[PDB]
Symmetry: D2
Subunit: 307 residues, 4 copies
């Protein structure tokens, strides 16, 4: 049902944690999803950008979606990231994700092998009939800005739930004034996006760390002092490209093992020490996990290319 996707305000693009040889750590993963549920997260993107969907083989990506649905699907909406720059891969991944019971699909436009606007419509029309879909526009990553006129055309399909928008609040505004549901994809804009530009909520990286605070920010009104308390954390999280920050942070909080699939590599020690300061400034009680935050040594990290 599309309405139940359009109602969600806090959707976590959840991190995918790894065992020391690079396989998925399902125990760590299930603990992360439980913590999100317990703090009032309402949806999860499985294998999004933050979840390193880009480094999974399809078999592990589908498995992670079916696993999430099977263990948690009665307590949180499960949105599979089954988009691709290849229409073939997007069709197969999407019908398989819905077949295993996911509630919605996140679809990016084709990245790297960008196409024409007419190719864009054709790509999205190949999958939009399969179930509730969120379209993801992030031109800083894909190389291509999905134009509003393509979204207005696609939003004729009742399966289109809305758009995860990264271009900025002026774009959010153009959609929401025209009746298209939008989730901000920029944590550091999502407060204003919510309260001033009609965004329904956020598809967040930062809620991997402080889900209770992100939920407060999306449900309890303007609170620019809470927003600006979170801004240093968000800036830290994006000092290098996502998910490098979140991968480093979750290892420091002891909820994830310090294992990276290449090409990502941890933030250096000076940044890690900054994170230890942010956690003390904001308060450890707001962060996921129970263990004391650690700086970690460089020697603690495992980088794997053959996963």
């Amino acid at each position: 049902n599309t309405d139940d996707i359009k109602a969600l305000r806090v959707i976590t693009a959840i991190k995918t944690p790894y065992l020391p040889d690079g396989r998925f750590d399902l125990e760590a993963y299930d603990d992360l999803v439980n913590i999100q549920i317990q703090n009032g997260a309402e949806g999860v993107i499985v294998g999004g950008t933050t979840g390193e969907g880009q480094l999974m083989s399809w078999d592990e990506h589908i498995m992670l979606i079916g696993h999430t649905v099977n263990c948690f699907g009665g307590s949180i909406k499960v949105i599979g990231n089954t988009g691709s720059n290849s229409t073939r891969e997007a069709i197969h991944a999407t019908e398989q994700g819905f077949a295993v019971g996911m509630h919605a699909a996140l679809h990016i436009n084709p990245y790297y092998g960008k196409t024409s606007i007419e190719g864009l419509i054709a790509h999205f029309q190949s999958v939009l009939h399969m179930g509730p879909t969120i379209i993801y526009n992030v031109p800083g990553r894909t190389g291509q800005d999905i134009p509003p006129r393509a979204i207005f055309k696609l939003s004729q399909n009742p399966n289109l739930a809305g758009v995860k928008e990264c271009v900025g609040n002026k774009r959010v505004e153009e959609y929401t004034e025209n009746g298209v549901v939008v989730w901000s994809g920029n944590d550091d804009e999502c407060h204003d996006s919510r309260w001033d530009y009609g965004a329904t909520g956020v598809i967040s990286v930062t809620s991997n760390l402080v889900p209770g605070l992100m939920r407060k920010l999306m449900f309890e009104g303007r609170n620019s002092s809470l927003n600006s308390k979170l801004l240093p954390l968000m800036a830290w999280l994006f000092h290098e490209p996502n998910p490098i920050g979140i991968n480093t942070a979750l290892a420091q909080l002891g909820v994830s093992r310090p294992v990276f699939r290449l090409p990502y590599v941890p933030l250096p020690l000076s940044k890690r020490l900054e994170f230890v300061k942010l956690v003390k400034e904001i308060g450890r009680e707001h962060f996921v996990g129970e263990k004391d935050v650690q700086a970690l040594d460089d020697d603690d990290f495992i980088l794997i290319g053959r996963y």
Copy 2:
């Protein structure tokens, strides 16, 4: 041997033609490669952006490399596009591409899931030991400009042959002043890149149509009137994102079937009528194949999602 790669001036990023069910049309592909050889192309990229490597599965990609090596490897350099945004997939694809006998690899930086400069170094160092490599910088497609300082760090690796650069002639000049071999990735700049800015040559889209003229442009001295006669054809080929133009043109020339793997769709008839006029203005004798060029109807083109 890296020196043999360094010496190529004309490398064609060859188009991959399809059968109406979406599979590779190997007979048409062989004809295209033969045609390149008879016109003096010195290298092909197999499954590059132009060859839609992005739409292939790894098994069909490695197969096309091994097929290209087995049929043509004594007459042209075969450069497999075995890069990936995933280090795991880049390591596997590169190992297998070298095992079936390709002479070099083309490696892009990770697109879409972009990484830090440190991660980029880890990524390239995971494959550079395998054999002669060209690094590919096209930030308009990947979302990330590879900084010269990263290349300079890698360039003393004896396997780094040089860089396929799309940023422009000022970046070309910075690399060649610093002693890095550069191929221009922009057909509409490669003349000047070659004669004014020290590029060794071009990795070309336009040579799929006019290989003899592109060879002339890279070997015979500055020729600004040849260059400006090709410029309108070059603009036509990039009207929509490559390979939309080349896929359309080759179908009109009758050397490939009018079959598109999604998300690409053809140029519309008004552009296809311009292409007919360009062939006549430049001379059909310079274009690949021998069939009379056709305009084609929109209903000639088969758009396939489930390949």
Copy 3:
């Protein structure tokens, strides 16, 4: 939980039905599983021999397991056939099947590339720790009889639920006298296996057609007149190798489309006419579906090699 697998008496190796181009027909499949549930089937093997697991790619096999768990897993035990002649494929398929929530795994011994008894133990020990497992011995198909001493050793693992045994009642007896749970894999022996040789029940092909009668046979005592009423049907079902009969029968009853993935091909018209007679002799009210049984013409069947 292993006990809940050991309790099941009627497990249907369910047929996998296809669309006209060879993809899975999930609508037809869901109707078959619903009919099994409604007639008191207690488990299903997903992608067994009968379900043509051997012709699926892994992605579709895992998908079918996760689909079955998600739609039906609260009303019937879902047993994935995640065995393989390759230990690698068996490990991956099995952990993925359990991750998507299947209740048990069916594991055959390595077929075609048969191994030593010591290789057999090693193969099974690679997967037995993952969850409740039924080991499948069918030497007429694999080329190798799993010996009782390998099963006695493996049955030290609390995850071993029991054995699907095809060698015959004397083998069933040897296991059941020693405390190992057995399901007969031979429909035409399963009555005697149940009542005289201690089998817990049957993993049945014939219950795809007459699930209510197979359930009666397994729960309601010796009834050799019911058994011998079913024998002509069972003999028909195995006139050619399974699943050729069941695929032809379900198409005749109108619950499946008449589409075969090669190398299977339908029974000829004279056999189909015999099936029409068996259905009238036993009574259409005992067979799955509501449509009148049809002979079908040869022209109605679709055989597909490129699925």
Copy 4:
């Protein structure tokens, strides 16, 4: 060309050696192939039963074929084992194997999911049009004896080169009396098959160890004393199912690493000490490689499941 296949008398089903992580050891593989060439082997089967095609993924299988073609295809016939119990996989694998340049295909009848004789015809006819083919009958592994009448139906297809027959010399004689080319698949029968029953030659396991002697056995006339000197080595190689023996022997000769992909495990030390004694009795100068033969300890062998 089919006539060139028909003329080969000594074809080695080459072993695939592994690195300790489970990947192919291509350097050792090249040495083994070179050694076959220097001793007069005329064809190799790549990824046959002996080469563990059954444990490979299709991409590594097609890669090994293309690698074998690219490095050795001018000096030996390369016959890809591209058969499968799945017609879909046999069609794809065969197309790709021919595309990377193999000279012929080896096709087994569908094993485990066995089909009717009509289905078997449909299966073989789906791949026979692709190029020169040897059909492989080994009912002790597949569960199904291909009947001569099926081969006779297919043998007027100009692509059928002939049959690799494991049933025995009486079946060999029936085929050769009927004008079908036959290679013996049983090392311990191939002498008599060759000199008494009209076989053209052998597709051999034992030539992985003693290629020069096996060539002698097939080319130089009846030699019953050479034959009976090889018989004890041949018995040793089939003590457990092939390729357990050959994998053990090559490791002891030091031409491959002591690495096994599961489900195969090595022969125990008492057999490995017999192999040392056989090398000495026959003469090390006849065996592949030049390292002194070693017994090896059980703890030398790496058994890998997650390759």
